[PDB]
Symmetry: D2
Subunit: 237 residues, 4 copies
């Protein structure tokens, strides 16, 4: 099985796998049963923004989510990612629906990783920024039901020709290049990610959510990971 | 009196003001008596690099210092800088000598500050990078004995025409623009700084050190702040 | 008198000073009588974006302006800016109204300048990005009628309490730090600027326009530079 | 056959394929017979830096090469790259030796590509920066004799265990992700690249050179492209 670290924007409360009884933001370390959660006042049909930050000095994975005109939600968890993830990873976005559903539309995604060595300075970095997505977006690896180019956006889960979200859908987008998150000479390693999203549903109960994740380079959607598993995990262990 | 937050590279142990009995890196919050220190294996005559990082989510000021071919030193301290510093600040480098002395030569200095609001994204930033310093470096405010342009470097303390460091010297360089570190709409604020330095002395006992600092916009060198006060503080309280 | 280089977004045709008979984008080198113009299909009440680029190898000042859903306009002019401007400059935005009027609202402004020397690499840079403007925006020098903070924007010219633009108005905003555009060791120097603007008028004939400019560090609004002079020039020579 | 655009640092004069009678920098558009050249005072055993710049407004490919303590060389050529290259490309470094030889050592490589659309702003970008290269550099596609990790560098051509360059060698390194250089909504597209290199030879006549190139995504070393063909072209047409 893959190795996954993720920040989830979890729209549906599954209380038997430890979700709180409300939409929430969570930090997931090798399990869908988040290590830490915070209440998230999710707004159906509004564009929101998520930010994720980490560095190897402090060893704290943190995230913040907001909408215009609204207060933010934040969550943090102390974890040494070099003890969880391999030295080379891929980074991605994932989303799912089940019997309950929503659009999982990404309007923008940026990421920056840096490795500073002890050689005079000495800086190594990767940065990408998407503010549109075209039909043939060659620097993304699309998995499952994910598509690019409809209204210039990344649709992680299936949307009907009329714009209605579909149930029982899972999809992911991974950046094409592998990312180097640990190196033996690094004195500080850091990453930051931001994405803007639009979660809409005809229903009072949207599901299931969107996640930013970091994985082994060869990660793939686990079998049966629709719905509450967010396209990330094979089971709810 | 000014308000100062600083990361010190303290080359001389002054044990009556709480220094450990060795060169050390420290976090200074409104006092020269560091809140946290770590041992620093300072190398006379070699070029080193310091990194300083902070964000308003985690509220942890951290620093790392290294040389080529050597292990690093690091220090961290939990502090909410919005409860210490004003909303607008200046950022700078400071150094001093006393009866013991050293060169306090800066070869490069970079800084990045970001304020992310809840408006769609919404990013505000300041970045500067110096890898040389000319004679008339109009975007630096020089204080005390600091000069620019000798061998293209920033000499924080006085150096004789022959290159020998002088005693009883203090000097600072502040970036010309004020820096916005808090704003009411910000959902995350962060800063990072890096500088490369060359501390050389003819003597077995160099003094006194170099600091990266953040201050009120109108900060000036306190009277009598040569030597152990690092050009930062009026007394050792 | 100041030394001015500017890219004008000129909303009102003043045919006796060489304007074409339509709104236009122009390159202004020490005169309001542009060296080069292109037709600009200005849209009253819509948010547009302008981009300005230059480097010292090619010695060509270029600009592009667009709106969403519309084609762009572009203009270029061959000019060695080191023969026009001093080594240190300030950069700014300017706008005016006369007997005809418009809002001259800036929603965002970014700028990047780089000087690459022959020392190993060796990079020097300044970057700033504003996506909001607060009431007390200490890193801007405001001149004339310019204000910050109304709806989070920079209003270059006066707007009544009800939002109606006023006539006979001029205002500018300059970045606080001086900018180094030439240095003796530089092997390549470049700059890029972007700003987003909203020009609205109740009238079929808006005036007078918005400009991005580069000037001597001590530049000030010339006497009598409302209307067709764009807050930039003392006369129409 | 591949489609190649390159900037060559050509160390050996092959006068029957149009080289000038001295080391030179050149712009190569689909042929090893440069469209434009300039004299290059190459220094055996010294670290140099090359810069390459282009944008779609001006349609001018320019390059500058220098050493510390020395004057620069520059070359430019007017060319619309959207009429030469496909919309998606890979970017790379190439080098070769023949019966004459040199080390073709890369110490650093950076690249930035940007696509600005007419949507509010709207920015898309890719940036990478290498200041070291490890043994298993997963974000580089190595071709031919290229290796990474010896002394932390990228060795494009073969070097014996003792550090002597070998003859009859060719090697390339391409960034792993495809790069988007044209898009239908872009109003400005640009790229910039920088690399630092060390060309050393025991011989009074080093050969053959180093190039930065842009190619179809599936580009490979052409058969027989050692020596004067620089790992780029199948023949000297
Ligand atoms: Ca759930
Ligand atoms: Ca001390
Ligand atoms: Ca006019
Ligand atoms: Ca040749
Ligand atoms: Mn959950
Ligand atoms: Mn101390
Ligand atoms: Mn005009
Ligand atoms: Mn040639």
């Amino acid at each position: 099985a893959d190795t996954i670290v993720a920040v989830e924007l979890d729209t549906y409360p599954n209380t038997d796998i430890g979700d709180p009884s409300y939409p929430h933001i969570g930090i997931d370390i090798k399990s869908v049963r988040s290590k830490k959660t915070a209440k998230w006042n999710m707004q159906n049909g509004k564009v929101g923004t998520a930010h994720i930050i980490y560095n190897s000095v402090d060893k704290r994975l943190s995230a913040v989510v907001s909408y215009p005109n609204a207060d933010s939600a934040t969550v943090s968890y102390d974890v040494d990612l070099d003890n969880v993830l391999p030295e080379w990873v891929r980074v991605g976005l994932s989303a799912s629906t089940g019997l309950y559903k929503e659009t999982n539309t990404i309007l923008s995604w940026s990421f920056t990783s840096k490795l500073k060595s002890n050689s005079t300075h000495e800086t190594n970095a990767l940065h990408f920024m998407f503010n549109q997505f075209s039909k043939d977006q060659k620097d993304l690896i699309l998995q499952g039901d994910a598509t690019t180019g409809t209204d210039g956006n990344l649709e992680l889960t299936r949307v009907s020709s009329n714009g209605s979200p579909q149930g029982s859908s899972v999809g992911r987008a991974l950046f094409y290049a592998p990312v180097h998150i640990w190196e033996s000479s690094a004195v500080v390693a850091s990453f930051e990610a931001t994405f803007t999203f639009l979660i809409k549903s005809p229903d009072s109960h949207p599901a299931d959510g969107i996640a930013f994740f970091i994985s082994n380079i060869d990660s793939s959607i686990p079998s049966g990971s629709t719905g509450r598993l967010l396209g990330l995990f094979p089971d709810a262990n």
